[PDB]
Backbone:
């Protein structure tokens, strides 16, 4: 789901602080066809994989 | 489904509801089945 690179200086190492595991059917986008009646809290959307 | 690369679409009977009977059996370990060295 779109991780390109670490764009930092080439002598600094990266380390995380939280690991979030998800299930095998994850997608961070909402369904766009079920948003056409909402006014408040309209999220960005796309077409998730099958 | 399994993956998300559409390989082909020939002869895909996607009009059904019947999840078929699979089978059942009982695992019997009395003679060595299910063990390893
Ligand atoms: C890497 O690129 C992003 C966007 O192009 C920018 O925000 C960031 O400051 C860059 N990092 C460095 C170390 O140049
Ligand atoms: C899957 O691929 C075949 C051949 O490339 C095409 O005819 C079919 O429409 C595709 N299915 C979808 C859902 O795009
Ligand atoms: C379900 O599959 C059977 C054969 O496996 C077929 O005879 C039946 O018509 C199918 N049901 C539907 C609703 O198409």
Residues:
């Amino acid at each position: 789901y779109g991780f390109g690179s670490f764009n930092v200086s080439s002598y600094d190492v990266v380390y995380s602080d939280h690991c979030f595991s998800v299930n095998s059917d994850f997608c961070p986008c909402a369904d766009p066809s079920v948003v056409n009646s909402c006014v408040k809290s309209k999220p960005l959307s796309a077409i998730c994989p099958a | 489904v399994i993956g998300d690369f559409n390989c082909t679409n020939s002869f895909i009977n996607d009009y059904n509801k019947t999840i078929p009977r699979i089978s059942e059996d009982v695992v019997d370990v009395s003679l060595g089945l299910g063990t390893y060295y």
About this structure: The interface with chain A takes residues 1, 4 of chain B (CB under 8 Å). Residues 19 and 33 of chain B are 30 Å apart (CA to CA).
